[model samples]
Target: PASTYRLQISAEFTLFDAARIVPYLHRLGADWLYLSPLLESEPGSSHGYDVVDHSRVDAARGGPEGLAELSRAAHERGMGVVVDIVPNHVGVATPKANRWWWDVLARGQRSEYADYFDIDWEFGGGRLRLPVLGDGPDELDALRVDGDELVYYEHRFPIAEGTGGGTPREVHDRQHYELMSWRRADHDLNYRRFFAVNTLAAVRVEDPRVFDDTHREIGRWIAEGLVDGLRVDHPDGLRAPGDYLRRLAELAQGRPIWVEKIIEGDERMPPQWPIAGTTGYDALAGIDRVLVDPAGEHPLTQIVDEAAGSPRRWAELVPERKRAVARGILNSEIRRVARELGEVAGDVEDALVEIAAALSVYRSYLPFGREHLDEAVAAAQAAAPQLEADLAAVGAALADPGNPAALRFQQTSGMIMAKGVEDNAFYRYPRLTSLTEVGGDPSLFAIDAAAFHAAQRDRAARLPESMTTLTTHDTKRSEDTRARITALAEAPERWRRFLTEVGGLIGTGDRVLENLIWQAIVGAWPASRERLEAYALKAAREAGESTDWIDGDPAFEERLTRLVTVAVEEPLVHELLERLVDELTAAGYSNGLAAKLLQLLAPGTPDVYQGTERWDRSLVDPDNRRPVDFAAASELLDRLDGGWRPPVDETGAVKTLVVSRALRLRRDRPELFTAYHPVTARGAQAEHLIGFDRGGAIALATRLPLGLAAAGGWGDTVVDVGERSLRDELTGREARGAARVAELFADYPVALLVET
Candidate 1:
């Protein structure tokens, strides 16, 4: 009921390793141990989202014995287990790694597992198209026959029994699957994939038998009491999200559940779905916005536009990027949807892409979110007036939930949204990348204290059991790293000066790219030169203005590499970066503490991403997935329990203090966090304090701290805490009615209060 802690289990850190940490997590006040997917995934897969076998736990991840031990350890400590599951897709990079894929490849339609995957045999002319070859059939010489298997480098596939009596090329020609160039996957692929990733093929879980087969192991966990709750990954990609949830709920027997749904602007989860709530990206947005100052948005936007050599609006940029995505990497999905629409006019296909590109949210839950689809149609009509008739026909065709065209369109909309916004536009728009989060809008900068309070009230009244998080494996930056970047909003003028000085010293030809790279480097300061180089290359390629993932851009990438080198080695640039980091450190720490407290004390069950309880200054995946030093954390926690008060500095000890205290309080006294109420402060600096009460426990955090300091530090400000004496849970201080703000926050800028 209090909180969960997530640990990414890999071959390096198996389930046995997780069991060893159970006591430490329990000591840290984690009510539940949330592990990533435990099913059999691709060999050596660091992240287990790529499930190859769901019938049992991965042997590399400790198998059934390992899971049993981990569950036993957690149960002994009074903590339940919640696991992430991938029902939408499975890994198929190595055919032999997946038995179902291997059998289908060998026997085609005659195989028992042919219907397991979401494949279009008709589109591929009665055979599957495997985009595994270096080049088209031209590179058939690379194929080697190893006994009964066809091998291409490290990848191996099963050979058809009767078609193996010729040259390698002839043998391949007679096989049930065609080995094509990897590039053809963009436009000619016949099977459904997870986003643009060709290695992860979609699963047909909507079939009743398919659901039973895929969920057999998960059902065993629930029946045997090895697991307590569940977190479903990517439900929007399913054929029927609501129906799937109903089946899952029946299997779970009323246990708590959450979907990894990215709730976008003003969007809520489908009310009828049998789940607690989403994975909490919406809660993340609410907390980030309230800490940001709205006054800085215009200045930052002006700087970004000027740097880019033209004006750019997020509102205008989104649709343009979505259109490009529909015509590029996601073209295969577009063609499939067009076929589903049954040989419509060419213009109708164009109209469909335009409408899907215009969708404001991820995907609609047909009949439930028909308004969203209607909005997209209206938007498309306005954008392309010539396609009015086509748009109308397309819109009407997608109204029936039973229509295959409608279902395909709904699935494709989310793919477009993710690639267009999070991957593409986010890199190009650098006003404040912290605003560019998974379920947030860069256009909406900040929310006032009143609005923040209202959102919390709504959450408590609605889905109080929903999971709220500040950091995640997929976040572009960790909470503390983003805290530093968010501080740039308050000092836009200083930021422009730095961009002008350091940027001039090492110009990368692309102004927006320069801004993004420098911001990332400075936000995660003390980052190694290697880290900076990798980040710059990925960021520039993602922006795709000067370079991209496809099509070579060798010279531009050289310039980016040189930019990172010069920024690190050039004395002048390094000095400027160091000064900037120093200026933002204090405010960043304050913001970090404030966000941590707010998320933990809010109305939902919060999740503490591994290593984020301390100062986690990480970037993206592979970077965020680096090994954590649990020994150091355990030792530090012991010292903290021994009453060694640590200062808020680069050491990050104070952050651990706040997290442990807040988590312990929530777990020990759940009643204190049951209801939401706003607590108000009155005086000159009242606006700087965001205070809220959850029944008896009250939380007060400093927001816009730089501005608060500039305003002379909460002069004469006092909060009304009724007549009863209150104690600060953070610093062990006491206060009562009309307590002075300065006294309550003498030791730290944030405070947690309880009745004495």
Candidate 2:
């Protein structure tokens, strides 16, 4: 239902770089100038995840005026602009918003916006036994609310008035306050946090006030035409997503809003949420189905099965282990927050535990409803039975009129804190893709696809004019990364061989496991080794493995010293890794060709990720966030637009050649874009190909990654096309009379037969 094919360019450049490139994006037939977050963020944040302010553009990215100018230029070139917005959390170190924290710390239960964040109030039974910021239990008792600020006190209160009473109180003292606790440290909690991440505070967006406050700037931007659409961060992290989205939609005044909702295959979005289609990964998979070979499933499954060591067992074991680790961190932080709150600390701690248990339970049984509630309850009971009892007691307390207003207020405040602290931080969950990786849950994919499709349908019904995409700045990996992984799923043996060799070179451990998992998931692209090595070293350093280099630990120091001894050492490693990556890169090119062809011709608006028209075998996160070479992509767009068709086989059938022809057909024949269901070709290889007829246009695409083409004896295969001889739109190849629609795919894996 889209009006036109949209070329989406995910501009990964800095603000200065964007300023330099905006003009080029306008000229390159890009309908939308999509960009990463431009908000003020922590220094040197290439991906802009650590946003410090929503109203102001990052100073390094040329500030507000720079963005306005860019917007103006894009509008002048007839291009709409899409901005990425991170609504989930903000950079905690900002001076401007730090007042909120100060107010919370100073007043504790009396703060004006006490319910704004998730916090933990209990510090291990009234004693400040948790740490506030970093390591150690003593650090918990050192945090205190000084006026309107949360100050780090350097002394701990005694368990009984003055047990450690004579401890010297110095600015550099290890313990100062008795209110902070490390036991409630989940960054997701209102009090402590879900993880140990201190700088990113969880907001209570479920509150109406919170929603209004957050939406104010966005509303202003929409009114002023500063943005054409919005890419929401993570809606799943919100307390009441359904209500939040409804409020957001009302505020947007019918503008496009796409949520950062990650749905595993078969999972669907809430049908009623007013929004444009998903950010478009689910659709990308639909396109992928056209290229993957069904025959490769067993081999691919075998490879992944062996490498990962039983997906089912891993799924069960990993989640439980992670939950335990997460709980330990949360408990430590909660204990610290309690000591800082003084008299109300006990109530706050109780609320924190209750909220944590409830939220954790809630997340465990997602796509929530009556069916999943029991499971969620069971999980919560297993993790913290006392927390469940506390929830009931708090609920009862809220209902009691006899409870003092101050006490009731404190309980409510604690509840919010506990919820945030117990839940996982935004984008900080371990193995985020676990549902898809090991759950063997088809609902995940289905749910995601249905949500996207429903959104697209709604947009078409309402606007009948909007652009959609697959890859964006915020995605952990590019669409190509998933495509490569999908390809690997077809060739598991080849992937296993590659990984075994790489693992032999790199010592096996968590870092190695991380690299191996990433490589397998992303496929064995030639550029992978270098990227993996760099990531591995970074992980090692962060894990404190590299500190031994300073102590002259031979094994750790040798390679570390060698890398540092010469400036070119890292570059040499990169060169070697790239060499290995090149082999897969070549294969990826073919995969890209196949995937791109399907995208261009598939139903709905096909959005080309910036520079993805050729090759984009990028790794996770910042690596995938590197700047796009617009000049190169623009040139390729020109070639495609100029009708420089791909070569055909000697038998006169070319997959790429056909795709180019189909794109032109879709462009010219508007009537053929109508919705149609897929129909299978009746045969043994029917599952290997997917066929669908829309109006008079029939699309037949290969479902197999690699396979034998119908030839020789298959030449006489009569296709029963109802009654008409369907003509190949690509080459104008004609099919004779038939009862059932069919075409000989002698040289090609699939074909499109359209009666024009």
Candidate 3:
């Protein structure tokens, strides 16, 4: 149950790059070297999750030889290897990359490898029309066949045997696969894809043969002792997550395991799954909110509502985007189901779309989950009486548990939640984007410190071995960035001032968009122009209100880019951002320290994302995936002698100390964290303090720092230690009896009190 180093073994960050960091991770207390997908994927793939070949590692990411070298290095430092596996989708995107995908395209239903992918061949007239080429099929002659492979400009596919022989265009038309105009892809697509991305075609891993084939390389790694554990990515996308988990567990030969599954607010993990636990998004969702003050809820909401000119609650805003996604990009999946069901439900398109739109969670696990489907169907029936029967039938099929349609419906529902909620509504809803994380609900303003303690206690009591993390490669924002934003909830009036000030100087386009941008900049302050530009552009495109990837509005994008540049160059905006971030820095450190220590102490095994040892003020994708300067972190770790305090001028070194110390405790002395006990803080501002004990050691952290600072600085707040003698590890200070919050947190916001 020791922690792992979340190394993103991408094209740029190869296995060799990770090998060099092994010694540092070892010193910092990472017992395992956890890696991103290392399998071969599409050419120049930055993230390896889009696998093209699962049998061998990607040559770009240092292949089998590179993995061997990394393994040796990690083993030298007593570290085990855990690889992230993607059994959900494959990069059928480029024909040259995946041989099986290429063969399936060439032979259609007759293809020996036809069953490898989850293509709806029966619905597509035994011909799979891929969304490639130009918006129009006007330039057919522009395409040509290159050595038995059909090619159209940069796009290409394979020619079937003895079916069609001639020009590239002739081969394309006669072959099982058809390259269609890009414009028709949204609603007219027939293939099962990973969400709306048609290039990332879904695979039928549920087929035992396909499962065996997909798991072959991973199985080899486990058997060879190269991999010690597994972190399954996107279990919801699988036809049967439990079945896959069981297979993965057996293959791993009883190694530790975890899955990336989102549990909604107050939702329980599916108890039947044969795994240690989820990847800790549940803790990620709660950690930030616990720091936010509930008092600012109305003021922030009113500000956001006015900015949007709509009083839409996030609860309502989420479904609006969900329905939009169901009709827009995910229209293909709905239509595919409609085609399969035929006349079972009248107005099949409308019926399937509504059913998908009404889903409450990502997807329901069939045979085990009928509540989500039933609720969604009931909601759809109430809203659209005209298609009541259609909705009813769709729900019945989803709940039947015996039908494959039920499984398909479950698969389709995940797209609705991901595309609508995480991608769209998350960006659209500006009410504390910290709460906008995956598995996080924005409606819950702030959960108090006691509730946080209660939740942590439950986690320790139930899944003591589950992984708990604050950030990941996939998180919408980084931990400290979210912590930075939590300050806004406390100092709402000051935040509003900055909004008026910074918003006027650099804000552009939509009011809602501007509000979100300001909040993002505030969250991720001290960021580069290039970084901010990339993140802002993606946000604007994903929101799809004024710009999008397909409908690239250069004029609007130019303005948005200008907004980003101004945030970079404008003196006024920069000044306020620096000041705001500085104000929140101490508090951020306090929260950051507390968050790290808590994760180490929590029941779930703590998994630290790369570079998060310090203040990781990154926002999504490339932002969070930036290279970490392990050398710098190590240098700071070396410099810690007197106390684990950051240099007055810097940010990360203190966090590095916190990570090293807490991790060393968890790794070196696992027996210390065997039980959970909640310790209370009493007096006027007791609610602002969180205190807990793991056996004899006590952990204390201040929540709502801004409110605490504003509400007269912890007046009369005392920790009810009740005559227990302890030394605070953070400050190297000794204290016994009842400790005052002011004195206890005089040196730092978080105190790790150990029995003397």
Residue-wise C-alpha lDDT for candidate 1, range 456-484, written one tens digit per residue: 88788788899999888988877888888
Candidate 1 stretches greater than 4 Å from native: 135-137
lDDT against the true structure, per candidate, is 0.88, 0.47, 0.80
lDDT of 3 by residue, 1-756 (tens): 588768888767789988988888888888888898988888888888789988898899999988888989988777788889999999866778788888787767777788778777766777887888687547677887777677787777776777556666666668787777877788888778897887788888888899888889889888887888899988888888878888788888888888888887776657877788888888876677778878889888888888888785876777678788788888888777666666775677777777777777778776566787788889889878999988887677668767767777788887788888888888887867778887788888888767887788777777777888898998888888887787778878887888888777765668777777777887787888899889889998888888987888898888889988987797876777788888887777677777777776666788889878777889989788888888888777777743446552455776777677778777887666667787788899988787688876677887877778878888778887757688876677877777788999886777787776
Local accuracy of candidate 2 as per-residue lDDT tens digits, 1-756: 221222222233554555566565444434555666677676666666566555667777777776777778767766667677766665554423445544553345456855676655442332222234554646635545343233454422222222223333332133222333333334323343322455666677767787677567777767888778776765655555677778877777777777655444344556677867556555554444444444455554445445445552333432443344334444444444344434442355654444334432223112333232344334554556655654444434333334442222322222332222212111112222211221123212222223323433443454233344445543444555655555544455665565555444543343323433445334424443456455434333323323311132346634533332221234544444455455344334444444554455455555555555445555444565566566665555455456554443211114324434554566566576676544445554444444556566766544433332322223333344446667775445676454222344543444567774
What TM-score should be assigned to candidate 3? 0.96
Q: What is the Cα-based lDDT of residue 710 in candidate 1?
A: 82
Q: Model 1 TM-score?
A: 0.98
Q: Rank the candidates by lDDT, best first.
A: 1, 3, 2
Residue 426 displacement (Å), model 3: 1.1
**What shift in Å separates residue 413 of candidate 3 from its native position after superposition?**
0.4
CA error at residue 41 for candidate 1, angstroms: 0.5
User: TM-score, each model?
Assistant: 0.98, 0.66, 0.96
Candidate 1's clash total is 0
Which scores better on TM-score, 2 or 3?
Answer: 3
Instruction: State in Å the error of residue 526, model 1.
Output: 1.8
